[PDB]
């Protein structure tokens, strides 16, 4: 009688889980692995108009409670991911998201013009990255830029799309960002959050930073970011009730996923933990979330989505 | 041969450890325990012109990786901490910092005026809280410039600033550019809690603290990489000032990393709340241990010497 199904965006998802953009989604072999997994969906690596090798290595490092990265958007180029969406993805398995991360509003609109007919025919769904912190400061920490990008994309792209947001840390920013997003009818989902930007890890033995780019500063993922991610999910759930919220950050167990959904998440994305465990993690996360709901008597996610209680 | 001593602000500190403002420093008894502890120094609860009861409880919550709090600046009032600094603190034990967190520039100035006689006579050192997130001036640069100007005109002594965490180099540069205009700012404390996190309990399906719909500042293991980044960012950009590190310290190795990033003093919040003042005995031993394994004899030998990667 229990169900993890999600019915949103004109699609049915078997469960709310998917990878986070950037993790296990850059090559055809990785995307096929995601498609073969039990995840409810998948999303491509954020892509640019041209292929990128990304930053010098080491550019990822495992931390005691998570991860730090300055990948620098290594990706096979937009044409590769468009071809994947248009020709290779098995949509009978699960819906597909494509993440784009052009370096200007014009670069993104040019990609969207070419994505539009493929999205129309095949059903791939756009997620626009406004929060890459490792290349070009983050568009979503500049509200005038943010508004410019959304205007340019909406003019260039006929379909609804979503946005990948950086974490904010005060209600003035939650309100300011929500005010802009609610003014764009095509923004139909908000993904909270990208990594916490520009953390720093130093090794005791070497006395040296652990990644090479940008003097060691890089984005934090994993358990470090979970309370921030929940806060952002719930702040935008409250302020943007006309849009869906996707939760991303710190998900290692079905209990973590349960809390994202209680904060308001429709879909739940998995980044650092998926890098560590591989795509069988989705078998564990569905079983664990179903165990949480069984002990509480819940039969469907809408029985508790967004229903976090106050004291 | 080895020493944890830190010579700054014209004082010799026995070691770099101290409580973080707000932890174990609100009552006469807590201040005494901190003075009796082996800490190199101590700092008072951020105080306000009048007494404050603070937010409705529960307003602190222990987490497995740290803490979330929405205290609400509960404090005995500035007069109490000034009287403590004036008469009751044994300065022969260790130096004393006083934290002030007035709700405007004029409130902070008038407090500083009343504090300046006591600073001069007794040597208490001011830390100006620009980053309280539970009732942040340092997230608005125009306001932070105006606070520092008002303080510098009203206060004839050096002081320091407690900074919120920043998350990109544009904000690091802008904050440093402002701080570097004010020579009376002789130290910068990085960081205050990461603001407006949210924790929910699986069993109750409810937020775990009562104020502000459950949103509050994060401390402890969550914040350590952000704390190190902020310490090092301001160490690089403010070479003419001292950096105090605060954030995620549970062990001597944690303190060692803060010093490599640039910290002169190392403040302890969440771990001290959990462990009590005996933590400073463990922390000095552990840091001396790391130094001994590496042949270091003084903190000046590796403060800020993090290598590239
Ligand atoms: C190695 C790595 C690469 C990433 N690449 C992207 C990316 O291309 N686009 C994006 O929107 N986020 C990217 N992210 C951020 C993740 O999507 C996610 O927002 C963040 O890691 C928090 O989730 P987590 O705690 O499960 O790791 C990347 C994260 C990592 C660790
Ligand atoms: C219960 C509690 C009360 C605090 N009160 C203050 C305060 O009054 N003034 C201040 O500048 N910081 C205050 N802080 C922030 C701490 O000084 C410190 O910046 C933060 O907890 C991060 O350090 P940690 O990871 O070791 O806890 C408080 C933190 C906690 C947990
Ligand atoms: O490619 C990357 O460096 C990257 C992009 C992004 O959006 N987020 C992240 O953490 N890393
Ligand atoms: O009193 C508080 O709520 C408080 C103040 C402050 O500056 N930082 C913090 O975490 N809590």
Residue numbers in the entry:
A (entry chain B): 0 to 134, 137 to 312
B (entry chain A): 0 to 134, 139 to 312
Sentences from the paper on this structure:
We present the first covalent inhibitors of Leishmania braziliensis dihydroorotate dehydrogenase (LbDHODH), a key enzyme in pyrimidine biosynthesis with a reactive cysteine (Cys131) in its active site.
ORO was identified as an LbDHODH inhibitor with an IC50 of 61 ± 1 μM, a significant inhibitory activity given the fragment-like size of orotate. Next, to validate the mechanism of interaction between LbDHODH and ORO and to identify specific moieties for potential modification to improve inhibitor potency, we solved the crystal structure of LbDHODH in a complex with orotate. This lack of density underscores the intrinsic flexibility of this region, which is functionally important for regulating access to the active site. In addition, the final model contains two FMN, two ORO and three glycerol molecules, four sulfate ions, and 588 solvent sites treated as water oxygens. The oxygen atom (O71) of the ORO carboxylic acid group is an acceptor in hydrogen bonds with the nitrogen atoms of Lys44 (NZ) and Leu72 (N). Similarly, the other oxygen at carboxylate group (O72) is an acceptor of a hydrogen bond with the main chain nitrogen atoms of Met70, Gly71, and Asn133.
